[PDB]
Amino acid sequence: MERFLLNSTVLLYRLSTVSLDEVSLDERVESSVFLAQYEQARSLPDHVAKSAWSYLVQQIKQRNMKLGPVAILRLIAEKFIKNEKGGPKIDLPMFSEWQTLMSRVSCLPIIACHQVFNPGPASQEYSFRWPLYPYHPTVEDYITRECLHETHQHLNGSTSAEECWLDALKHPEACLRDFEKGWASQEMKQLCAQIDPSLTPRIFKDRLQIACNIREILCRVAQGVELPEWIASMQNPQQLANSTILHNGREYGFATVWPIDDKYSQESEFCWLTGLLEKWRFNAPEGLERLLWIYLLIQNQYLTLLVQRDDMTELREETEKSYLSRFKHAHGAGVYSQVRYLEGRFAPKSDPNKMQKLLFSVLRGYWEYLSAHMSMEWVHEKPLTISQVLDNLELVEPHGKCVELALVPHFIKRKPKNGEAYPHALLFKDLKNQAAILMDMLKSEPRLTGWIRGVDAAANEMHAPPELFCPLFRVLAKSGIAHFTYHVGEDFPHLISGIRSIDDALRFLPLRNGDRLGHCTA
Amino acid sequence: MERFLLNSTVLLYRLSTVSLDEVSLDERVESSVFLAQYEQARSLPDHVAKSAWSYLVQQIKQRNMKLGPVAILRLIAEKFIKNEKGGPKIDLPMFSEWQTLMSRVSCLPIIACHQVFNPGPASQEYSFRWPLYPYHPTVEDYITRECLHETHQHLNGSTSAEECWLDALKHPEACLRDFEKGWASQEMKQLCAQIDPSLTPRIFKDRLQIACNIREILCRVAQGVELPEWIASMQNPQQLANSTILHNGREYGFATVWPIDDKYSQESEFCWLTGLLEKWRFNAPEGLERLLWIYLLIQNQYLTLLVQRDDTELREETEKSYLSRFKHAHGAGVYSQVRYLEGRFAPKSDPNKMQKLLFSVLRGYWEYLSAHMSMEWVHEKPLTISQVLDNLELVEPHGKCVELALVPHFIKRKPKNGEAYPHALLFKDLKNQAAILMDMLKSEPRLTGWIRGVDAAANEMHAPPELFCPLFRVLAKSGIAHFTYHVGEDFPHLISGIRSIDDALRFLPLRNGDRLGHCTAIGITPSIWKRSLPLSLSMTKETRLLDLVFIWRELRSHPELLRYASDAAIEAVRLAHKVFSLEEEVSITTLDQVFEMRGLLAESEGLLSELNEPLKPKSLWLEEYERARELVKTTGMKRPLKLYKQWLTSDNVRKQRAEYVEVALEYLPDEAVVALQQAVMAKMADRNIAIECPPTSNTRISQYRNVSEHHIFRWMGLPGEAIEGDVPMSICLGSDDPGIFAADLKSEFYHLFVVLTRKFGLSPADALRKVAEVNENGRIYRFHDV
Amino acid sequence: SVVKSLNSVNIKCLPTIDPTKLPRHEPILVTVTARLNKMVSDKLKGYWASNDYRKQKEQWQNHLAQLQRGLHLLTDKEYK
């Protein structure tokens, strides 16, 4: 039921605007929760919602704690997460419920609470990088004995959605400009109002700035350093939108020194958070308590926004470091990787001058992972170019315990463009253009044929029928791609139409034996 | 998407603030339509939604019209309304969709649009007062022979909800105060923000005033007269919130004069609207075209608000509106379509208030007879209770005119903390309310032929059904002679809901031939009930303990469902220690004995008051007071009694009862819950107690995907929807809170008939008989005197 | 003059109150608490965002609530 309490637009509107002095917000949050519960769970009866909230209140009061994130995270942590032989794990019967909760709430605050209020045995050091998994020994033997195989991993973008929030905090202006770029489109404008009505792009910058400043303010509490005492002049949370407060007519930024070098990172967030909740183990002022509540609510609002935007500026901010992290993240904990056969779908770029950047970064990211695990004498300690990476990668022996890679560029597809008397030429020429850079780069270095193995076209099905890609796939086949894959039947006007769309892809495309379709829900 | 352009919160906002001069709004309505449809039907996929709206767009372009109400109604009019021998009716295949539509859109514009563009044959005189019904020869002739038998109508208020909109226009100040008075309570505040967060008592007067002024403005266009020239100063609909528009500094106003005296009548709105759409048959000015859109949006908004708020104006509306109600129930034609009608009403504490309303209903019913029964009465103008009864004793029931049997229904309230037992303030009001009824009934004893039943329809968790045992039994000695309960519709847990009905069966003084209202607990299939629910629900400890003691009662008898009975009995004893805080041993037999004595009145001597008290002076209650006293003293067993006093008058026990507990959703397996439901059926069918069924057009359960899954079909015994081992019951028909705007019993009768023929595939001759059994059970268990 | 000298031995002085400058039926004890509530709530705005801030406000909410019940004791036209 707490999915409404820790992820809801109405509560964020209620908490941010309401002043900080008042502590009698138990009535306002209840009305907000009922509004939030009704907006997202239409079929849930009200009498259950009234009973569930009333039962939740008595749980907090019986435990002699106060309503807020420090209490909700306490209840969620012990309900789902219990310590196991692998450290912190998840209840098997409650895993199905837990997966639903992850759709609306990030686990990062929860696990910090569980670590503080239920530490593991022997005090062995535990660092959070990977989401928690339920533990069942019969499956664990299968994974170790036979590693997993991922057939769909979008290399572009972030490793997951949780850590992209930290990148959004690291790049406030860049993400704001990115958001404004898409905000022009009618679909994106409706989508944002769908999840959060009355969301102007300035408010998104305001909320991002509020979350940034709250992080700086709360970091002071966790480290034990005395607050800079200008907070008394801050009577409203809205003063955090401008990233500068004026106390006694002087400039006072909220920024503060972080002990960790990378203040915007998974390690930094957990180390800060576990210290903060430790200091609030018995007492917590409702002012700061709500400051943490606002920050958690702000994070969940952005996460809800991000997960639906998939269905550049921020993408190319680093362009090299995330590729190593994702491969290491795909590798997982332990000495042996849990995933053996993995292919990374990435969107091709029309610029010929960008492929050598993207291919090298992925290949350099792959190599710098391999050199860390397999210790052997490479031709170059710093490749700096595609050819030198290929020299290093051709020396490795696949023993089956490390993440193997086979790049598959997945083409993009846009709305139909009117003109010149047949449906798709403006879009078709773009696909013809993008393929040429893919085609000629393959011929420039033929050794790339061992990594660029497949080609995908994954945007939708209404925009361009699959038979339009029949000439495009066949010419790529003559270039030596040696694999193909499609993505069909996501949304279809009628169930019979979806079946027809599969056959059009099936009967017309040059799909040899062993090809793979995509998301055939029809 | 025709149902999202007439009932949509954001579109009203996105059109009210937009000035009339600008016309480019397709990109703004389309963004509004998708957003509004998302917050209404969240499960509709976008690709279906985007295609659906575009299909509507090109259809209008094909018809060569302009997007707006004048075009939206036309598509709906040519979609649903089809002419027939009886005039404008609704086609059978799409009747079910119309009922889904009617929860969002008032029908009155549609018939007005249909009449203008698709008129009847030879322009035969058409008078619309009742909502449109589908036509089926197998059914319509059944009504002619055997009229319908309604069982639950709330006479407090008008006939339907569509005409209550006109009353809101007639009383802008009164409807504001009623909304404001409700808005003070938190439940209405949540409910109003539930429908639309941007709603304030300041805004509600604004919205209603705009609708009234738009009505006056369009009436001038409908009359054909030219505008009164102050439309030059018309730039925004917000101007229509003050009833005073200034042009060149000269005084003006919005009100006009109508051809009929009563501008706020049903006839006036139809003549206005039909005239208005007649003059827009080819093209319409955009400024007024949008003004009509605002009025329909406002009208549907208030109707949407009114229906939900249902789940001062009352005094003014409770005078001679009953004559319209009976005429509305009678319907067109010489003979009424409903023969046995049971109109419920809410009693009031003050004897003058209750006497005045009782006279109004009886006088109103006589007026309905005097229009049909052209026969000389003893008193031509009764104007008093006695002369009404003397006049009414001269009429005989010959199966043509409506027959009435009033049934007051008490209202349960929240348990006020304190006063030594759970519901003292509540029971003091009920004891007073029934006291006014019983003595007034004894003042005019002929009323026992009309005041026939007693009901109690507020909620279920507020007051347990067993609380009405002492107050009903005294009323039985008062001559009421029929008791009905409104039980089992709302419950925190399905197994707990089963207990509530079985609390009614075991405790209430229900004799053979009584009825129960909305027994949804024994209707919903447990698999269907679990749809979209959390993995663990919550319920109060007292409601949980009464469940655990009950589940042991009806499961230890079951030879194979013993594990559940044994586990329940074990853990019920565990919970009893938690609640009573007792230290000794209490067995499941003792718990049942304790809980079988909860039907006694708290104030009975020897139970809560001192045993040695002087004897009260022979009221109708002394039978009740001493009965709960002597049986408690006797049987040589007072150990269960002392447990019961703590269950009533202990500070810790009462606090522990209200403390909530966590119950798993699937505590009983799917088959296990069915065993309880079939146990209720055997008990109540043995007692032969009918069940009132709510209208199937009421989407209040929020658990059924469509109407075809409604639990009424399970009771009647439809193959593919009847659970094995079910004991068929007697089910009557009633239309109390249909949840739609314009409804009637005949429409509900047709709704049942349509589903059987289409979804379940039944022949019309066979389909009618199954729904005829329900219509006749309302006559077998009628509360009307013989 | 005297109130400013004390406002400018740390004694905090309530701002001047005129009983004639009040509603006719409004008791002065209501105004004194209402005026005093402004001064105390102002300090809690300063003494905000600390552990003791909750521990000081909880007493304050207790005091106003228990004093509120005494208004039914006095303002009632006849005790029930």
Q: Break chain C down into helix, strand, coil percent, rounded to 5.
A: 60, 0, 40
At residue B699, the 3 state secondary structure works out as: coil
In sign, the C-alpha dihedral spanning B318, B319, B321, B323 is positive
Let me know: does B478 contact B441? Beta carbons within 8 Å.
yes
Q: For A240-272, b where at least 16 C-beta lie within 10 A, e where not — what string? A: bbeeebeeeeeeeebeeebeeeebbebebbbbb
Let me know: does A323 contact A361? Beta carbons within 8 Å.
yes
Let me know: does B542 contact B505? Beta carbons within 8 Å.
no
Let me know: does B347 contact B451? Beta carbons within 8 Å.
no
CB B373: neighbour CB atoms within 10 A? 17
Give the ranges where A184-237 is alpha helix by DSSP (H): 186-195, 201-223
State residue B384 phi and psi, 5-degree precision: -160, 160
* Residue B733, strand partner residues: B693
Q: How far is A287 from chain C (nearest CA, A)?
A: 6
CA dihedral C34, C38, C43, C46 (to 10 degrees): 140
**Rounded-to-integer distance, Cα B666 and Cα A14, Å:** 36
The strand pair at B407-410 and B660-664 is best described as unpaired
Q: How far is C23 from chain A (nearest CA, A)?
A: 28
Let me know: does B676 contact B494? Beta carbons within 8 Å.
no
**Rounded-to-integer distance, Cα B701 and Cα B91, Å:** 27
Q: For B74-111, b where at least 16 C-beta lie within 10 A, e where not — what string? A: bbbbeebbbeeeebbbbebebbbebbebbbbbbbbbbb
Q: Break chain A down into helix, strand, coil percent, rounded to 5.
A: 55, 5, 40
The Cα-based distances of A371 to A396, A397, B664 in angstroms read 10, 12, 52
Let me know: does A386 contact A446? Beta carbons within 8 Å.
no
Interface of A with B (CB under 8 A): 1, 10, 27, 31, 34-35, 38-39, 41-45, 47-48, 51-52, 54-55, 58, 94, 97, 186, 189-190, 193-194, 197, 462, 491-493
Q: How far is A230 from chain C (nearest CA, A)?
A: 10
The Cα-based distances of B763 to B146, B766, B773 in angstroms read 20, 5, 16
Judge residue A39's burial from the number of C-beta atoms within 10 Å of its C-beta, 0-12 exposed, 13-18 middle, 19 or more buried. Answer: middle
Which residues precede gaps in chain C, with C-N > 2.5 A? 8
User: Cβ of A288 and C41 within 8 Å?
Assistant: no
Structure tokens at A299: 């994070």
**Rounded-to-integer distance, Cα B398 and Cα B402, Å:** 10
DSSP string spanning B182-212? HHHSHHHHHHHHHH-SS--HHHHHHHHHHHH
Judge residue B52's burial from the number of C-beta atoms within 10 Å of its C-beta, 0-12 exposed, 13-18 middle, 19 or more buried. Answer: middle
Let me know: does B767 contact B716? Beta carbons within 8 Å.
no
Q: Which residue of A has its CA nearest to C46?
A: A232
Structure tokens at B686: 């043995």
Task: Give the DSSP letter of residue A96.
Answer: H
Question: Nearest-CA neighbor of A254 among A272, A237, A278?
Answer: A237
Question: Nearest-CA neighbor of B168 among B306, B324, B346, B326?
Answer: B306
Structure tokens at B472: 């009903």
The Cα-based distances of A378 to A381, A395, A450, B696, B784 in angstroms read 7, 8, 19, 76, 100
Integer-rounded Cα radius of gyration of chain C: 16
**Rounded-to-integer distance, Cα A318 and Cα A327, Å:** 16
DSSP string spanning B532-553? T--SEEEEEHHHHHHHHHHHHH
At residue A424, the 3 state secondary structure works out as: coil
Sheet containing B690-693: order of strands: B484-486, B515-517, B690-693, B731-733
CB-nearest to C48 from A20, A24, A283 is A20
User: Cβ of B27 and A186 within 8 Å?
Assistant: yes
Helices then strands (H, E): number in chain C?
3, 0
The Cα-based distances of B634 to B607, B630, B631 in angstroms read 12, 6, 5
At residue B83, the 3 state secondary structure works out as: strand
Provide CB contacts within 8 A for B604, sequence distance 6+: B470, B624, B625, B626, B627, B628, B629, B632
User: Cβ of A287 and C57 within 8 Å?
Assistant: no
DSSP string spanning A381-422? SS--SHHHHHHHHTT----SSS-EE--EEEE--------TTS
In sign, the C-alpha dihedral spanning C18, C23, C24, C28 is negative
B491 contacts in A (CB within 8 Å)?
47
User: Cβ of A47 and B662 within 8 Å?
Assistant: no
Structure tokens at B185: 């309570």
At residue B134, the 3 state secondary structure works out as: strand
Provide CB contacts within 8 A for B184, sequence distance 6+: none
CA dihedral B126, B130, B133, B136 (to 10 degrees): -70
The Cα-based distances of B506 to B179, B501, B684 in angstroms read 40, 9, 9
- Looking at this protein, which amino acid is placed at residue C32? V
User: Cβ of A287 and C53 within 8 Å?
Assistant: yes
Q: Which residue of C has its CA nearest to A217?
A: C49
Let me know: does A41 contact A104? Beta carbons within 8 Å.
no
A20 contacts in C (CB within 8 Å)?
48-49
Judge residue C20's burial from the number of C-beta atoms within 10 Å of its C-beta, 0-12 exposed, 13-18 middle, 19 or more buried. Answer: exposed
H/E stretch holding A82 reads: strand A81-84
Let me know: does B607 contact B629? Beta carbons within 8 Å.
yes
Angle between helix B562-580 and helix B541-555 axes, rounded to 10 deg: 150
How many CA atoms lie less than 13 Å away from B650 in the CB half-sphere?
Answer: 16
Angle at B21 (CA atoms; ends B20, B26), nearest 5 degrees: 75
User: Cβ of A235 and C49 within 8 Å?
Assistant: no
- The whole-angstrom distance between residue B263's C-alpha and the CA centroid of its chain comes to 29
Q: Break chain B down into helix, strand, coil percent, rounded to 5.
A: 55, 5, 40
Judge residue A358's burial from the number of C-beta atoms within 10 Å of its C-beta, 0-12 exposed, 13-18 middle, 19 or more buried. Answer: buried
How many CA atoms lie less than 13 Å away from B86 in the CB half-sphere?
Answer: 16
Structure tokens at B52: 């659906």
- Looking at this protein, which amino acid is placed at residue B652? N
The strand pair at B407-410 and B403-404 is best described as unpaired
- The whole-angstrom distance between residue B638's C-alpha and the CA centroid of its chain comes to 44
CA dihedral B192, B197, B202, B207 (to 10 degrees): -80
C45 lies within 8 A of chain A by CB: yes
**Rounded-to-integer distance, Cα B568 and Cα B548, Å:** 6
Provide CB contacts within 8 A for A296, sequence distance 6+: A6, A69, A109
Task: Give the DSSP letter of residue B483.
Answer: B
Question: Nearest-CA neighbor of A280 among A267, A293, A269?
Answer: A293
- Looking at this protein, which amino acid is placed at residue B14? R
C51 lies within 8 A of chain A by CB: yes
B763 lies within 8 A of chain A by CB: no
- Looking at this protein, which amino acid is placed at residue B400? K
State residue B536 phi and psi, 5-degree precision: -155, 120
Task: Give the DSSP letter of residue B615.
Answer: P
* Residue A344, strand partner residues: A153
**Rounded-to-integer distance, Cα B707 and Cα B100, Å:** 10
The Cα-based distances of A402 to A129, A327, A375 in angstroms read 19, 10, 13
Judge residue B502's burial from the number of C-beta atoms within 10 Å of its C-beta, 0-12 exposed, 13-18 middle, 19 or more buried. Answer: buried
Let me know: does A207 contact A298? Beta carbons within 8 Å.
yes
**Rounded-to-integer distance, Cα B716 and Cα B693, Å:** 11
CB-nearest to A285 from C45, C49, C61 is C49
**Rounded-to-integer distance, Cα A406 and Cα A454, Å:** 8
Judge residue A290's burial from the number of C-beta atoms within 10 Å of its C-beta, 0-12 exposed, 13-18 middle, 19 or more buried. Answer: buried
User: Cβ of A54 and B538 within 8 Å?
Assistant: yes
**Rounded-to-integer distance, Cα A231 and Cα A247, Å:** 9
Let me know: does A59 contact A53? Beta carbons within 8 Å.
no
User: Cβ of A55 and B662 within 8 Å?
Assistant: yes
**Rounded-to-integer distance, Cα A462 and Cα A490, Å:** 10
At residue C55, the 3 state secondary structure works out as: helix
A227 contacts in C (CB within 8 Å)?
49
* Residue B89, strand partner residues: B82
Judge residue C23's burial from the number of C-beta atoms within 10 Å of its C-beta, 0-12 exposed, 13-18 middle, 19 or more buried. Answer: exposed
The beta-strand segments (E) located in A101-226 are 148-154
Question: Nearest-CA neighbor of B532 among A170, A401, A298, A45?
Answer: A45
How many CA atoms lie less than 13 Å away from A27 in the CB half-sphere?
Answer: 7
Structure tokens at B625: 């007071």
- Looking at this protein, which amino acid is placed at residue B10? V
State residue B410 phi and psi, 5-degree precision: -70, 160
At residue A87, the 3 state secondary structure works out as: strand
Q: Which chains touch B (3 or more CB pairs under 8 A)?
A: A
- Looking at this protein, which amino acid is placed at residue C79? Y
Which residues precede gaps in chain A, with C-N > 2.5 A? 311
**Rounded-to-integer distance, Cα B760 and Cα B714, Å:** 12
- The whole-angstrom distance between residue A437's C-alpha and the CA centroid of its chain comes to 29
Question: Nearest-CA neighbor of B661 among B461, B529, B492?
Answer: B492
Provide CB contacts within 8 A for C69, sequence distance 6+: none
Give chain C's end-to-end CA distance (angstroms, integer).
46
Let me know: does A233 contact A245? Beta carbons within 8 Å.
yes
